[PDB]
Scaffold this active site. Structure first.
Site, PDB file in Angstrom:
ATOM      1  CD  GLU A   1      -3.072   0.540  -0.041  1.00 34.09           C
ATOM      2  OE1 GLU A   1      -3.389  -0.628  -0.358  1.00 34.09           O
ATOM      3  OE2 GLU A   1      -3.482   1.544  -0.663  1.00 34.09           O
TER       4      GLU A   1
ATOM      5  CG  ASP B   1      -3.057   9.689   6.126  1.00 36.36           C
ATOM      6  OD1 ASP B   1      -3.095   8.479   6.436  1.00 36.36           O
ATOM      7  OD2 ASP B   1      -3.104  10.089   4.942  1.00 36.36           O
TER       8      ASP B   1
ATOM      9  CE1 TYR C   1      -8.325   0.461   5.445  1.00 31.65           C
ATOM     10  CE2 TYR C   1      -7.030   0.567   3.417  1.00 31.65           C
ATOM     11  CZ  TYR C   1      -7.132   0.743   4.797  1.00 31.65           C
ATOM     12  OH  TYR C   1      -6.056   1.208   5.529  1.00 31.65           O
TER      13      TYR C   1
HETATM   14  O1  LIG Z   1      -1.459   3.911  10.565  1.00 40.32           O
HETATM   15  P1  LIG Z   1      -2.405   2.883  10.472  1.00 40.32           P
HETATM   16  O2  LIG Z   1      -3.391   3.021  11.460  1.00 40.32           O
HETATM   17  O3  LIG Z   1      -1.748   1.628  10.628  1.00 40.32           O
HETATM   18  C1  LIG Z   1      -3.191   2.981   8.797  1.00 40.32           C
HETATM   19  C2  LIG Z   1      -2.180   2.870   7.653  1.00 40.32           C
HETATM   20  C3  LIG Z   1      -2.518   3.501   6.287  1.00 40.32           C
HETATM   21  C4  LIG Z   1      -3.355   2.567   5.413  1.00 40.32           C
HETATM   22  S1  LIG Z   1      -3.719   3.314   3.818  1.00 40.32           S
HETATM   23  C5  LIG Z   1      -4.899   4.631   4.136  1.00 40.32           C
HETATM   24  C6  LIG Z   1      -6.274   4.307   4.003  1.00 40.32           C
HETATM   25  C7  LIG Z   1      -7.250   5.273   4.225  1.00 40.32           C
HETATM   26  F1  LIG Z   1      -8.580   4.945   4.088  1.00 40.32           F
HETATM   27  C8  LIG Z   1      -6.873   6.603   4.594  1.00 40.32           C
HETATM   28  C9  LIG Z   1      -5.502   6.948   4.733  1.00 40.32           C
HETATM   29  C10 LIG Z   1      -4.505   5.977   4.510  1.00 40.32           C
HETATM   30  O4  LIG Z   1      -3.138   6.351   4.653  1.00 40.32           O
END
Ligand SMILES: O=P(O)(O)/C=C/CCSc1cc(F)ccc1O
Ligand SMILES: O=P(O)(O)/C=C/CCSc1cc(F)ccc1O
Ligand SMILES: *Cc1c(COP(=O)(O)O)cnc(C)c1O
Ligand SMILES: *Cc1c(COP(=O)(O)O)cnc(C)c1O
Ligand code: NA
Ligand code: NA
Lengths: 387, 264, 387, 264
Positions: B48, B59, B174
């Site tokens: 990803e 984010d 997702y």
């Molecule tokens: O930091 P975490 O909680 O482990 C999550 C990782 C990032 C997955 S990819 C993504 C998907 C979304 F729907 C929005 C923003 C994104 O960056």
């Protein structure tokens, strides 16, 4: 949805899936409120007895001497708080309350929306949270102290360019996790539906009052109504009631900064490019690569790097016309109104006045009935205009 | 059909998928290329990848800083596509998903962006700020260029949404484990959704948001999800070791090996 | 004279012989104006369409929760200019015009009267001259720039203590030589007759509007109306229409400064001594030797070292009652209104609010219908209250 | 009857009166006493003395500074009366008029102030801020203690005022030559008033305000006035020579000798 999210090609609901139920909730509470005579009576009482509604319509005789123009000004600078922004936040607060919400999340650049959100929440008993870019916080100490003194929590955002853009971001981030207890009080007639529609409707009084007022004083509708365009709330509020009156011209004024040609301006609707951002499809201050940029102006309050969807739409069909005014041009109009009418206008509103002044000056023998929306007070800009 | 192949393969191994996230160009192009190969070598099943954007409203701080660090290095979207091509020219089977924001794909034509994704070997695209209600043009363009349009299923999705997500999505669904924004800083029962999605023949679900430990990925698999995505926990290791690149790669290896082992 | 210059033992016309014809002229123009329906209609139009008349009457529900007091506030802070001072200067300007005068002479301490005189003159086309003590000029840069921006000439007086007192002196000095072309715009309900009478009459709208307003909203006259007393203009304006309503209490509030007992206050009517100064017989801040002294307060606008003759008189016969409020007490009331009602009150008005708050707090079970005159806006005091 | 005697005497000499003004206690008590004796010795016919007041609204900068300088020396109204007594104990016939403001005489009783004037040997009292319309109590008190109440006749006085001034005044009638405040900085036709005042049997007129040169006093006499008062021109010499007391007295002498010579 119950209402149309688009004004032609512009508008929409571009937010993460998680915030969609929040938007549908708000929309439905608005449709109901709008039908509720009890909501209407409460909103009316607050505007009249607390905000100072209706505001005056002042004829400017000195300013138009020796020409064939008759200029009047909508006295929004006389509203409690010093700006039009107050009408809006009261309604939105009553909506949050109607929904069972007890918390308010706010966005602010120059500070005005922050102060207005803070005062509405204090009056209506809501807990207010406000996001402000660290740059703007440092730049606007007076409004920050005003906000806190009114019981509001001010939170500096240091991400990105630490200005309005980034404040707008942190607010949605917060809202994506708190929408169940908090309501987001958006500050302009832009963003994801139903905000553009709700802000207009809660700012409609302006043109509505102006109509009856001019009809009484002149027995005729104006030839044109003029208003500055930062995000579009004061402009659309003036416009709305006159949209179906085809003989009345609607003119919006965007900040020209140091001049369009220098690229140092804040006129996206006319000199930007259509993009998708802030839960909306609309004209925007952008780099060639699609990276969101900043809007510049002598007035801090015309910083929003995009513009309301209903304006982009009224422009496309030819119903309304949009123009720009530079820093030096807005300063001249500020100086002129102080000197000849004894009114100190916000540098924001000064952009609107400056265009009305050009309309006169450029064609002094033209018969014209003009109304400028004086959206705010200029006590705020004394030091700026002084240095 | 990179996702289809991977999942059938993992199922034949009664295994879940471990998908790490990183921002393309953080802390620099060359170093980023190095981080990505280390990720794959240590066990990543898919990738990803986020391209640097000025306003990432979905984010948290960790990922917000990844974009900032990339910007500091001068990584442009065009430079990103160049990076993507090299990654595919090196790794032919690994599924690659792009994390995008609306303006970057609409900027110079929705169609042309997806065409570029095809030409580079990208497999899927998730546009964080486009809900189902507004996906039509992005969905259509993706399908037309053999790119899988990724849809988000929130933990509170009603039947109408579940049915829509199942019908429009491809590659993977997702499954948002939490509300709020990305961040391993705070943790996050999806059994009901997982079953209903399977019922409507949705693409295999990958659980994302807050996944930062081995036990968390084993739990996702046990719930019925085909795997898990982890970003902040990964990006945090990069942030930690900026002054020692070698240290970065070494620590990056240990984490993803541990996480991969947990999906068996 | 055509009218009585005295209110019992107080008042008079103590000016040099040379200025007597100027005072008789003014008086006669006022008696005529007052009978002229055309003057009345012009004064009315300016108040409504330019100043924002009528101002609102706001019920403060949050502030009186848990007690048996019902508090309302006269929204003078919503008047163009931010203070009650505006009503007055418009009428006086129309009087000067009626007399054939083209020049205005003004006195100002904190700056408010200066700004108000400057705006009235700009609107009505009069040349404005303003005297300000060098100390106050340095202390009030924002108002000085506002004044100049409005076309007014600001003149620093370095004589004596270089404050309001000395500004008042230089103005009369000027007037003794220019009375034939210039009109002196006195800033409060004090000084030589006919000023105390004229200022009241041109400030009467306040209580007049309050009466009808409370009668509509409660169907009863208030139990008491409260107002701060610097020189007496806002207080008398509120009082006037209720003087013949014996059941309505009239309460004036004087600044207590650091405390009466410290001698560091501004409460002459109650803690000073009767003397003759500023063309008047009235209570005054004085040394034992009769040398005129200064008044102290956290609010710069309550600096006038004397008080209006009609107040000294209403006090002597027992019609009105006067009290004082200290610096710390006025700060508390400022803080409280911001926090619970979202209104930022001038530190001047805060003295009046503070007493209404005491009335409640001290006897919470007492049924009471109160009206405080919120004479002005407090944006001016943000930094002061902050340090 | 000090004024009556002086005027009859001056008339028998076909001469006008030259009356200088100074503020009691400027630049200091001792030096002020010295200035006053120099004034008399050089030819002054009478004296006009101002007691230091905080707000002299009928005085220009020159005299405003005289009050300030006196205040700087710490001269109090009680100290003033002490000074006045010594001046009389030294000079028995010279008329002495006091320039006063309202509050100083009303302060601790109007009656008691005039009683103190009598006890000290003061001849007249002019209260600069009390018009005829408000003089009753001051007039009555003055007459009761054999003090002459001085009334001001402005250059624009109508018949009603002239008749009032003539009837109430005593000692001398203060003929204001100009409008505005005291000041020799700017100069100033009173024939009509002078005749009408004489017609109503008013006290002899002394012209004051702006008189600063010999020719000015000769003109006053020629018009029909019994003399002239001069303050700023006198006080200016004090201001000029503060660092050289001896220089002050010497220059003070030359000016008043010149001015006196002009009334012959
Ligand atoms: O930091 P975490 O909680 O482990 C999550 C990782 C990032 C997955 S990819 C993504 C998907 C979304 F729907 C929005 C923003 C994104 O960056
Ligand atoms: O300075 P100049 O013009 O020569 C005048 C001298 C001072 C005369 S005494 C006097 C009389 C007044 F009616 C008012 C103030 C005063 O000081
Ligand atoms: C808040 C603000 C604006 C920016 O306005 P929009 O109406 O939403 O474009 C404009 N004028 C004033 C005085 C403001 O305070
Ligand atoms: C000008 C000023 C005053 C002083 O008032 P008076 O009414 O004449 O005593 C009081 N309040 C405010 C807000 C002022 O601006
Ligand atoms: Na904009
Ligand atoms: Na006072």
């Amino acid at each position: 949805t119950l209402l149309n999210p688009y004004f032609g090609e512009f508008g929409g609901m571009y937010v993460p899936q998680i915030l969609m139920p929040a938007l549908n909730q708000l929309e439905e509470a608005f449709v109901r409120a709008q039908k509720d005579p009890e909501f209407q009576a409460q909103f009316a009482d607050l505007l009249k007895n607390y905000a100072g509604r209706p505001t005056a319509l002042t004829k400017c005789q000195n300013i138009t001497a020796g020409t064939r123009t008759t200029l009047y000004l909508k006295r929004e600078d006389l509203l409690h708080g010093g700006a039009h922004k107050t009408n809006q936040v009261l309604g939105q607060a009553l909506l949050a309350k109607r929904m069972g919400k007890s918390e308010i999340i706010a966005e602010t650049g120059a500070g005005q929306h922050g102060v207005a959100s803070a005062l509405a929440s204090a009056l209506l008993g809501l807990k207010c949270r406000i996001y402000m870019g660290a740059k703007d916080v440092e730049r606007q100490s007076p409004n920050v102290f005003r906000m806190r003194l009114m019981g509001a929590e001010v939170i500096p955002v240091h991400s990105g360019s630490a200005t309005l853009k980034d404040a707008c971001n942190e607010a949605l981030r917060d809202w994506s996790g708190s929408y169940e207890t908090a309501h987001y009080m958006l500050g302009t007639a832009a963003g994801p539906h139903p905000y553009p529609t709700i802000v207009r409707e809660f700012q409609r009084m302006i043109g509505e009052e102006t109509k009856a007022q001019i009809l009484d004083k002149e027995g005729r509708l104006p030839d044109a109504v003029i208003a500055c365009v930062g995000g579009g709330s004061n402009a659309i509020g003036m416009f709305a009631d006159f949209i179906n009156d085809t003989s009345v011209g609607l003119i919006g004024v965007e900040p020209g900064g140091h001049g369009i040609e220098t690229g140092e301006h804040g006129a996206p609707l006319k000199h930007g490019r259509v993009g998708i951002y802030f839960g909306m499809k609309a004209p925007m201050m952008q780099t060639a690569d699609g990276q969101i940029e900043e809007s510049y102006s002598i007035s801090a309050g015309l910083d929003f790097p995009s513009v309301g969807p209903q304006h982009a739409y009224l422009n496309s069909i030819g119903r309304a016309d949009y123009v720009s005014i530079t820093d030096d041009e807005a300063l001249e109009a500020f100086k002129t109104l102080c000197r000849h009418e004894g009114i100190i206008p916000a540098l924001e509103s000064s952009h609107a006045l400056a265009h009305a002044l050009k309309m006169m000056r450029e064609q002094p023998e033209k018969e014209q009935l003009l109304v400028v929306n004086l959206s705010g007070r200029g006590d705020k800009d004394i030091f700026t205009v002084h240095d | 059909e990179r996702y289809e192949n991977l999942f059938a393969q993992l199922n034949d191994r009664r295994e879940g998928a471990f998908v790490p996230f990183v921002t393309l160009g953080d802390p620099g192009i060359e170093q980023s290329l190095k981080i990505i190969d280390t990720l794959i070598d240590a066990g990543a099943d898919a990738l990803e990848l986020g391209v640097p954007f000025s306003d990432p409203l979905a984010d948290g701080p960790t990922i917000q800083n990844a974009n900032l660090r990339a910007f500091a290095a001068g990584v442009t979207p065009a430079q990103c596509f160049e990076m993507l091509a090299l990654i595919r020219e090196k790794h032919p089977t690994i599924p690659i998903g792009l994390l995008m924001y609306a303006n970057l794909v609409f900027n110079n034509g929705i169609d042309a962006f997806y065409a570029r994704c095809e030409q580079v070997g990208v497999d899927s695209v998730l546009v964080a700020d486009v809900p189902v209600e507004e996906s039509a043009p992005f969905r259509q363009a993706a399908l037309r260029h053999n790119i899988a349009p990724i849809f988000i299923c929130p933990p509170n999705a009603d039947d109408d949404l579940l049915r829509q997500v199942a019908s429009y999505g491809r590659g993977y669904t997702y499954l948002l484990s939490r509300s709020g924004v990305t961040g391993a800083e705070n943790r996050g029962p999806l059994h009901h959704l997982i079953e209903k999605l399977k019922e409507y023949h949705a693409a295999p679900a990958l659980q994302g948001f807050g996944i930062s430990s081995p036990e968390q990925v084993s739990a996702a698999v046990r719930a019925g999800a085909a795997g898990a995505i982890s970003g902040s926990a990964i990006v945090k290791i990069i942030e930690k070791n900026l002054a020692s690149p070698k240290q970065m790669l070494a620590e990056l290896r240990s984490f993803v090996s541990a996480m991969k082992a947990a999906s068996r």
